[PDB]
Design a protein around this ligand. Sequence first.
Ligand SMILES: CC(C)C(=O)Nc1cccc(C(N)=O)c1
Length: 185
Amino acid sequence: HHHHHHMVHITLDRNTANSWLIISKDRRQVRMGDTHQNVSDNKERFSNYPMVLGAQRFSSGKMYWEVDVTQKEAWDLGVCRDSVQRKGQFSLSPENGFWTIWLWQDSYEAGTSPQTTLHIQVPPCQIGIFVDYEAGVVSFYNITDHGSLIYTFSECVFAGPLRPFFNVGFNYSGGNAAPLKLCPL
Ligand SMILES: CC(C)C(=O)Nc1cccc(C(N)=O)c1
């Protein structure tokens, strides 16, 4: 792909984080802690899942960023509306304001309703995410496989400002402790 010149510097918003997440000083990495991280509760925090938002809000233009997923067993990545539900149980779908892909149990899937099987021959260590606000497009790229396309959501109805979206996943297995990292430009 040729989207690299739309690169944006994403940072994580501590206030939106599930209370078990540990965000690095530079706000560029996040991992699951083994306990509550001693923060107060607030209406922005995702309560049920290990999720956090980027601080940046997008309402126009073309944006690109990259995320490192090395050695993780489970994660979700993409964008979401600023006004997505934070509390309780919900599914990741465009109807609920999410445009995402994930890894779960050795398979990759796009967060459509119902979910769509992805076809990835080279398991990615870094994911590229491209948003074209005006066109209504969110695309995902396999940086480990020379930028090959993973999935395109088209005809997106964003219906609000967008934020970068992250889920580090649970670590019930002891094999999913590794962080998500925002990769340098
Ligand atoms: C920051 C203060 C003013 C607040 O709102 N707290 C709070 C904490 C947990 C749940 C809720 C809630 N869901 O009402 C509200």
